[PDB]
Design an enzyme around this catalytic site. Structure first.
Site, mmCIF file in Angstrom:
data_model
loop_
_atom_site.group_PDB
_atom_site.id
_atom_site.type_symbol
_atom_site.label_atom_id
_atom_site.label_comp_id
_atom_site.label_asym_id
_atom_site.label_seq_id
_atom_site.Cartn_x
_atom_site.Cartn_y
_atom_site.Cartn_z
ATOM 1 N N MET A 1 3.920 6.911 0.191
ATOM 2 C CA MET A 1 4.476 5.827 0.986
ATOM 3 C C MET A 1 4.421 4.532 0.164
ATOM 4 S SD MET A 1 5.613 7.060 3.766
ATOM 5 C CE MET A 1 5.424 8.133 5.224
ATOM 6 N N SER A 2 4.004 3.424 0.769
ATOM 7 C CA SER A 2 4.100 2.140 0.077
ATOM 8 C C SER A 2 3.100 1.900 -1.052
ATOM 9 C CB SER A 2 4.028 0.989 1.080
ATOM 10 O OG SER A 2 5.280 0.834 1.724
ATOM 11 N N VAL A 3 2.205 2.847 -1.306
ATOM 12 C CA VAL A 3 1.487 2.800 -2.570
ATOM 13 C C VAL A 3 2.525 2.836 -3.694
ATOM 14 C CG1 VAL A 3 -0.062 4.047 -4.120
ATOM 15 C CG2 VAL A 3 -0.651 3.788 -1.706
ATOM 16 N N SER A 4 3.686 3.419 -3.401
ATOM 17 C CA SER A 4 4.812 3.432 -4.340
ATOM 18 C C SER A 4 5.184 2.030 -4.826
ATOM 19 C CB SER A 4 6.048 4.061 -3.684
ATOM 20 O OG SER A 4 5.806 5.397 -3.288
ATOM 21 N N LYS A 5 5.009 1.031 -3.964
ATOM 22 C CA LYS A 5 5.367 -0.342 -4.321
ATOM 23 C C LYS A 5 4.556 -0.851 -5.503
ATOM 24 C CE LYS A 5 6.893 -2.141 0.181
ATOM 25 N NZ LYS A 5 6.952 -0.845 0.900
#
Length: 378
Positions: free
Chosen positions: A103-107
């Site tokens: 999820m937003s760890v991708s950011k």
């Protein structure tokens, strides 16, 4: 029109191939070697039930840690202290080398790629977004600087709706008639009152960063994420990233990888930006991340209620707590958590029933903080 994008393969026309053209030449040469990018696909295991608990070291200080991990729907948990894996847990049915959606760890991974290009002098954070993506003129991204995108300090009308439409545009949900064709087109539809300087967490920001990366390098974000980060980590496995119908990687949320490999990103951060395959980002970049963003910009009480002196910069959440903890965070309980004090990285990949409630964050942050302190010299 969203301008030039990196071709799916050498010589490919814009937008090619599609679900309906990939069997035709010249597309099929590429497509036959990459069909998973076109059509949902399952692994057929080359290997022919119980949770694996090797908490060991910290288990003494935290007796009921396994139960606490179970309570927070933990799928993979790994503690890297220095270069050593000192604790691991994987639920029944999830193998140590299985990959898990970030999820937003991708950011935080995307911000790292941007930082690498800043280190190279190919991106100037002070420059307006439109210096790199002119086609974003007339949108909420017309005016703000690249740094303001990195720190998410742009006021945007983004219904948290835009959130569903964003997923439909990228292929995470079933398309509805009238929806933007791809992620780029969706981004150009975004508007705001023009104000900047206050933190507003918005996933669109990260995808604009990836678009900038593509325009600056000429590489698909999928390839840029490898070239500037993943391929330098000496990872055990490839990562994966969902892609939309143009082949654009869902930079803000769509990366999957193993817990051990994700920890290699944290290790790089705690090593001043250097990975086994070479420098990823500058010492300065890492220092600015660990230092945090403007506190006054951070008005998200969901964060500051736990971390009053917290902030956000360059796609990382900064707790501003006494330990200087910083973390990548993704919904349903994903953390790439840095504890510089003990030179440790904590990876927790989870599947909370709910995406983002105070209840789950309280429990999760309790575990991360308790584990961090358990690593302190005594």
């Amino acid at each position: 029109s969203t301008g030039q994008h990196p071709a799916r393969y050498p010589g490919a026309a814009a937008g090619e191939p599609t679900l309906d053209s990939w069997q035709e030449p010249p597309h099929n040469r590429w497509a036959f070697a990459h069909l998973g990018e076109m059509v949902p696909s399952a692994a057929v295991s080359r290997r022919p039930g119980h949770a694996l608990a090797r908490l060991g070291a910290i288990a003494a200080q935290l007796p009921d840690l396994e139960q606490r991990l179970e309570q927070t729907y933990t799928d993979a948990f790994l503690v890297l202290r220095g270069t050593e894996v000192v604790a691991e847990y994987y639920r029944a049915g999830f193998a140590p080398d299985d990959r898990h959606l970030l999820m937003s760890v991708s950011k935080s991974l995307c911000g790292t790629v941007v930082g690498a290009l800043v280190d190279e002098g190919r991106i100037d954070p002070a420059q307006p977004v439109t210096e790199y993506v002119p086609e974003l003129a007339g949108s909420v991204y017309d005016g703000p600087s690249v740094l303001q995108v990195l720190d998410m300090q742009i006021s945007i009308d983004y219904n948290e709706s835009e959130v569903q439409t964003h997923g439909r545009s990228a292929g995470w949900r079933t398309r509805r008639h009238g929806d933007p064709a791809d992620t780029y087109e969706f981004l150009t539809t975004l508007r705001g009152d023009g104000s900047t300087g206050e933190f507003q967490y918005c996933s669109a920001n990260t995808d604009v960063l990836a678009w900038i990366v593509e325009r600056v390098t000429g590489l698909r974000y999928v390839e840029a994420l490898s070239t500037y980060l993943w391929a330098k980590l000496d990872a055990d496995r490839d990562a994966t990233i969902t892609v939309d119908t143009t082949g654009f990687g869902f930079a803000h949320g769509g990366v999957s990888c193993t817990a051990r490999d994700l920890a290699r990103v944290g290790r790089m951060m705690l090593d001043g930006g250097v990975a086994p395959g070479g420098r990823v980002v500058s010492e300065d970049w890492v220092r600015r991340v660990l230092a945090g963003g403007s506190h006054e910009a951070m008005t998200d009480k969901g964060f500051t209620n736990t971390f009053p002196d917290g902030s956000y910069t360059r796609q990382w959440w900064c707790t501003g707590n006494e330990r200087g903890n910083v973390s990548g965070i993704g919904i349903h309980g994903q953390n790439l958590w840095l504890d510089p004090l003990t030179d440790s990285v904590i990876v927790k990949l989870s599947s909370w029933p709910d995406p983002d409630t105070e209840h789950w964050h309280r429990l999760q942050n309790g575990i991360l903080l308790d584990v961090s302190r358990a690593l302190d010299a005594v």
